[PDB]
Nucleic acid binder design. Structure first.
Lengths: 60, 60
DNA sequence: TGTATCACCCGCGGTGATAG
DNA sequence: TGTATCACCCGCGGTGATAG
C-alpha cells in the first residue's frame, strides 16, 4: 500500500530518482532491472520506500 | 500448503534429507540456517519441494 | 529419521570433505 | 520528472564514471 514493482516504479519515476530512493547507484537499478530480479517496493505515507526481493532457493 | 520454514523443516527432517531435497549440499543448509536467511519451503502433494527466499533490496 | 566445522572459487553462497 | 554501457572488487551485485 502501495505495493509496486521495481521496474514499474522505475518506469514511473526514472531510474535515477528510484535509485536515489533506495540509496544505491542508478547503474544498480538498471542492472537489476535488466537482470530480471523480482523486486518490490513498498511506499509509505511519507513516501519512504522499502524494497524486498524474492528469490528461489538455492541461489545457484 | 504446507508452507513451512527452512529451519523448521530442517528441525523436523534433519539437515541432510532436507539438503538432499533441495539438491544441494548439507553444509549449505547449515550455513544457510545459521546464516539467518529467510527461506521457505513449499510442499506439494507428492512431496516435492520448492523454496524461495526473501531478501531486502539492495543486497548490500 | 545426527550436525558442525573447513578451505576453495565463482564477499556472499555455494562445494566437497572431513569428523563425530 | 532521460538510460545504458564500462571496468573494478568484495560470480552475483553492487560502485563510480563516462556519455547521451
Amino acid at each position: 500500500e502501495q505495493r509496486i514493482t521495481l521496474k514499474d516504479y522505475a518506469m514511473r519515476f526514472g531510474q535515477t530518482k528510484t535509485a536515489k530512493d533506495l540509496g544505491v547507484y542508478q547503474s544498480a537499478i538498471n542492472k537489476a532491472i535488466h537482470a530480471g530480479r523480482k523486486i518490490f517496493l513498498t511506499i509509505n505515507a511519507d513516501g519512504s520506500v522499502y524494497a524486498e526481493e524474492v528469490k528461489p532457493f538455492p541461489s545457484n
